Amino acid sequence: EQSICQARAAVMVYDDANKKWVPAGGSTGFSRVHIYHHTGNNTFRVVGRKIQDHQVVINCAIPKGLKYNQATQTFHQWRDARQVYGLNFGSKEDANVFASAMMHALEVL
Ligand SMILES: CC(=O)N[C@@H](Cc1ccccc1Cl)C(=O)N1CCC[C@]12C=C[C@@H]1CC[C@@H](C(=O)N3CC[C@@H]4C=C[C@H]5CC[C@H](C(=O)O)N5C(=O)[C@H]43)N1C2=O
């Protein structure tokens, strides 16, 4: 598996019951978020690790046809059959790096 981008973001998951964003993995803070490319079957996953303690806070597939929503220049989100994910980027450049790679992945799936 090959990293096609690295971006700084606080990884959030939406608490449907309480209608509130909560930190992925339970601990507030920024992570290094990759998109990893598995070339063997041309699959991509979002994998993010907290800068402080290396905890994996997100590890989710990127399916063909995903709707990736750029709500703001620093807050992007998407949904799967179970959860809603949100990335609160540390900078506009980080959001741009990540969005570029996500859009690339969705084009070649
Ligand atoms: C129908 C639907 O699911 N729509 C999604 C967006 C979306 C559109 C298209 C494809 C996928 C997605 Cl996830 C949607 O809007 N969702 C699902 C999570 C809850 C939310 C529905 C309503 C609210 C409106 C506010 C927005 C939201 O949560 N925002 C806007 C960007 C803003 C930026 C940062 C974060 C953290 C600070 C603040 C907060 O949560 O207090 N916040 C937000 O308020 C974020 N919201 C959402 O993101």
Curated annotation (Swiss-Prot):
- Subcellular location as annotated: Cytoplasm; Cytoplasm, Cytoskeleton; Cell projection, Lamellipodium; Cell projection, Filopodium
Q: In which tissues is it expressed?
A: Expressed in myoepithelia of parotid, breast, bronchial glands and sweat glands. Expressed in colon-rectum muscolaris mucosae epithelium, pancreas acinar ductal epithelium, endometrium epithelium, prostate fibromuscolar stroma and placenta vascular media. Overexpressed in a majority of breast cancer cell lines and primary breast tumor lesions.
Residues of the WH1 domain: 1-109
Fill in the subunit field for this protein: Homotetramer. Interacts with APBB1IP, APBB1, PFN1 and ROBO4. Isoforms, containing the polyproline-rich regions with PPLP motifs, bind the WW domain of APBB1IP. Isoforms, containing the PPSY motif, bind, in vitro, to the WW2 and WW3 domains of NEDD4 and to the WW1 domain of YAP1. Binds the SH3 domain of BAIAP2-alpha but only after the autoinhibitory region of BAIAP2-alpha has been blocked by interaction with CDC42. Interacts, via the EVH1/WH1 domain, with the Pro-rich domains from VCL, ZYX and Listeria monocytogenes actA and with TES (via LIM domains).
- Domain remarks: The EVH2 domain is comprised of 3 regions. Block A is a thymosin-like domain required for G-actin binding. The KLKR motif within this block is essential for the G-actin binding and for actin polymerization. Block B is required for F-actin binding and subcellular location, and Block C for tetramerization.
Sum up the protein's function in the record's words: Ena/VASP proteins are actin-associated proteins involved in a range of processes dependent on cytoskeleton remodeling and cell polarity such as axon guidance and lamellipodial and filopodial dynamics in migrating cells. ENAH induces the formation of F-actin rich outgrowths in fibroblasts. Acts synergistically with BAIAP2-alpha and downstream of NTN1 to promote filipodia formation.
UniProt similarity note: Belongs to the Ena/VASP family.
Q: What else is known?
A: Required to transform actin polymerization into active movement for the propulsive force of Listeria monocytogenes.
Q: What is this protein called?
A: Protein enabled homolog
Per the UniProt record, the source organism is Homo sapiens
